[PDB]
Design a binder for this molecule. Structure first.
Ligand SMILES: Nc1ccn([C@H]2C[C@H](O)[C@@H](COP(=O)(O)OP(=O)(O)OP(=O)(O)O)O2)c(=O)n1
Ligand SMILES: Nc1ccn([C@H]2C[C@H](O)[C@@H](COP(=O)(O)OP(=O)(O)OP(=O)(O)O)O2)c(=O)n1
Ligand SMILES: [Mn+2]
Ligand SMILES: [Mn+2]
Lengths: 407, 408
DNA sequence: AAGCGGTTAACCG
DNA sequence: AAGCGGTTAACCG
């Protein structure tokens, strides 16, 4: 089977591993990094082993580890797997997306944008604002509660059996999407087992296949909803319905509830969940994918700016505490030294402002820059007060220039 | 042959490629890493091509590029930049020669040799020297070989390793790897820089992984001869220390060293004529070795090493002051030299340097260097307070180094 | 247009 | 103790 042969090819497996290591080497978890160093060493052989197993069809997905990601909703069920699992999983995604028509068709879908190669949030935001200015005068925006968890692996499998034409790739794909948690007993003891995809409901959050799986799951939804003069733009779970009449979108959301109902999914009702979903005249402006889409103006959603000001606020108080602490105290992290804090704050402004460069949030950005400018001025004066009466050593640990005598 | 089989191992080759990739991917050179990313793409095939060729013995080293590199003094480092396949096969050769060749493992093994050897550091040599002093070595001569890589003779190196390798194919690969062929030779000849590069049998390429091992193999006869008759010779690459009970014993040793070096075509800086490259005198008073000042009681960074550090730090502060003035009036700033970014980098320079001399015990000069830092620092604050007193918010953000969202 | 062997950003050849 | 897809470090799911 040429499809299966691609999966066992060393070009694919090394391509996949390149993708996996790019993450592992940066992992906060030392074990993941070191497991990757152990895989990077013996690299020709460490992938040939997998290639060998895959070829003789005796590859074994190792038991995973289910952890709880700090989360509004229930702690995200993060399924962390060994490197060979992640490598074989990333391999499957690469071969599926270049060789399977249904996959490329699902990637092709014009109204789907999340987790699709060559597709970005900005493109959706553009299409949305294009629908207004073509007769979109009202909206509903909603998302699927616990989407992955409610995804059914039996429906996933049944949709994929036709377009696979390789019973071996079917077995591999089947084992790829199972979750066998090795810490299951500890997880039962905390009463946490039930949120993980240990049964047929759910896909592993943390597998590379799951976003494709999700997008395949809503293939039917995407088609049904783009009809009746109602335009639906979906990024992952989030869907924006755009229409001429409030009545029209209201009915469409009702059709959506039935459409997601067939496949086990609900959708936050805008009137019921104003903080999770939205409804109204597209003119008032609406929040979508972190932007506020007004037809005159487009900018990051207030919540995104709020988050950003809160992260900035935290850093600045962190610095102030440190400036007093470093004076009169020998030990400091030095992360919060004036030099380090400003350096972090500068790169935070870079990283965030870099993603919103498409947005024109200038009235808001100037306020965010006004917030930063004021915060910067305060700390500067705060430190000069302390520096005004300070010996060289104190200023050194305050400013963040290490002392050689203490190394 | 097991030796050659080893070199044609894709695990051997990939190991070599990993080390080459780590260097090329951080390379300042536009050309060099572009070449490396392309090799990382197509990686599976990129290396089998080399493996096929190595197994077939059809492998061809490609033409290299010679670069005279400005060095302190009028001296130039003859850089030989090679294509990625050259570089991979050469690191492959090094990795195999150092794990399978008995002579090679013995040369790395020698106790008195420390440069470019795995599991070996400058401190281990400084420690060995102090012990020799503790057991009665009260006088020393320290010297260096001029242009050592340039004067090594490939034919002697081949003669030394030919009995040990036991494979004609390994020997042929080694000869091709040692050899230098330059694409840029006509341009160098017009320059007059052609002679510096190892185009001839004399010399070993700088920028080749093999060349540091070759030098250790070349000086192995010197290492045994020097460590005799009450004299301990400790060598890191070219640099050598002769340790003895009496000045006469060290003086006699230097003459012996020149003779051992002379047979192999090498020479040493004279301790009386050149203060910078050789020293002579009593170990009880201090002497410099490998950037350390080795006193029987105290070890510290050497005075030259501290001057470099003081200059590197001074440069950083000069740049910071200039940018302080520039980032106020203009917007074309580099930002690397903004107050926040400047102070942050200086801190990490101070980290890395103090980390290098943790094996030293002298605090007096560390304290004086700390004082100099605090002086330049407080000056820079004076310069920042001044500029910012007459400043709007936009200038304050450009000076301090907290970029504006508007300018993204 | 910037390379190599090595060490706990840096250091030594 | 920390994962995934996608995009010009971050953002969005
Ligand atoms: N860091 C990650 C990783 C994966 N996903 C995936 C899994 C979710 O099922 C899907 C939908 O995105 P949501 O943020 O809406 O996630 P949930 O549907 O789980 O949350 P909620 O119940 O709050 O809608 O996106 C995600 O959102 N965020
Ligand atoms: N950055 C460096 C420093 C040194 N070396 C190698 C090649 C040199 O020939 C050898 C000896 O180091 P020296 O610094 O003593 O250099 P030279 O012997 O070439 O010059 P000099 O006459 O100044 O001693 O170490 C190197 O490859 N790269
Ligand atoms: Mn959701
Ligand atoms: Mn020299």
């Amino acid at each position: 089977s040429r499809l299966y042969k691609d999966i066992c090819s060393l070009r694919t497996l090394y391509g996949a591993w390149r993708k996996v290591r790019s993450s592992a080497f940066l992992s906060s978890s030392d074990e993941i990094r070191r497991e990757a160093e152990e895989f990077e060493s013996r690299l020709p052989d460490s992938l040939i082993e997998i290639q060998h197993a895959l070829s003789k069809q005796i590859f074994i997905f190792l038991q995973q580890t289910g952890v709880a990601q700090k989360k509004g909703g229930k702690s995200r069920p993060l399924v962390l797997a060994p490197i060979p699992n992640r490598v074989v999983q990333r391999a499957l995604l690469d071969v599926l997306q270049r060789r399977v028509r249904l996959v490329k068709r699902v990637l092709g879908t014009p109204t789907s944008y999340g987790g699709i190669p060559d597709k970005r949030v900005a493109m959706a935001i553009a299409d949305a604002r294009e629908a207004m200015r073509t007769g979109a005068r009202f909206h509903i925006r909603s998302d699927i509660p616990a989407f992955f968890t409610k995804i059914n692996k039996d429906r996933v499998l049944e949709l994929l059996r036709p377009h696979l034409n390789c019973e071996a790739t079917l077995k591999l794909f089947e084992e790829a999407i199972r979750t066998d948690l090795a810490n299951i007993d500890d997880l039962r003891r905390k009463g946490l087992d039930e949120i993980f995809p240990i049964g047929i409901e759910g896909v592993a959050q943390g597998s590379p296949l799951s976003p494709l799986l999700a997008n395949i799951y809503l293939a039917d939804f995407d088609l049904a909803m783009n009809s009746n003069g109602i335009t639906c733009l979906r990024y992952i779970d989030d869907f924006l319905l755009l229409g001429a009449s409030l009545s029209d979108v209201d009915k469409a959301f009702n059709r959506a509830l039935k459409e997601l109902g067939k496949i086990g999914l609900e959708a936050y009702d805008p009137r019921t969940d104003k903080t999770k979903a939205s409804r109204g005249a597209t003119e008032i402006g609406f929040d979508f994918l972190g932007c506020n889409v007004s037809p005159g103006l487009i900018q990051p959603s207030e919540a995104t700016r709020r988050r950003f000001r809160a992260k900035l606020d935290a850093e600045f108080v962190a610095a102030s505490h440190a400036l007093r602490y470093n004076a009169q105290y020998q030990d400091g992290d030095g992360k919060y030294s004036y030099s380090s804090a400003l350096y972090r704050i500068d790169k935070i402004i870079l990283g965030w402002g870099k993603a919103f460069t498409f947005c024109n949030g200038s009235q808001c950005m100037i306020a965010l820059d006004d917030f930063i400018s004021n915060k910067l001025a305060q700390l500067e004066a705060e430190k000069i007060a302390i520096l005004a009466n300070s010996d060289s050593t104190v200023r050194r640990r305050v400013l963040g220039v290490r002392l050689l005598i203490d190394i």
